[PDB]
């Protein structure tokens, strides 16, 4: 996420724009996922469980 602060735009709006760009790019989510090792069996188990949850 690369955010460029615009003319006559407050700091509060620029930071909120950055926080949304990080949320869109999944910055904190990709760091949470890579922090610790996950077994192929575990990531396959998670993918199956999420696919079942995506049925309402």
């Amino acid at each position: 996420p690369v955010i460029k602060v615009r003319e006559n735009e407050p700091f509060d709006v620029a930071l909120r724009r950055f926080k949304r760009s990080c949320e869109k790019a999944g910055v904190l989510a990709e760091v949470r996922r890579r922090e610790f090792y996950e077994k192929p069996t575990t990531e396959r188990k998670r993918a199956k469980a999420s696919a079942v949850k995506r049925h309402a």
């Binding site: 996420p1 690369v2 760009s21 790019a25």
Partner: protein, 55 residues
């Protein structure tokens, strides 16, 4: 019909950071999302498209 040389069309299916946009967002067909990803990767290698938004 899809080609790595057409960096014009290719730029529509990649994010601000250079990441390939998933089919769920773009609404493209399964067969052609695979064809796209190959072309984006072919164009990335040939420095016609970037890998990351750093360089």
């Amino acid at each position: 019909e899809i080609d790595y040389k057409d960096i014009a069309t290719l730029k529509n299916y990649i994010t601000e950071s250079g990441k390939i946009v998933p089919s769920r967002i773009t609404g493209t067909r399964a067969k052609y999302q695979r064809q796209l990803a190959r072309a984006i990767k072919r164009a990335r290698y040939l420095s016609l498209l970037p890998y990351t938004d750093r360089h």
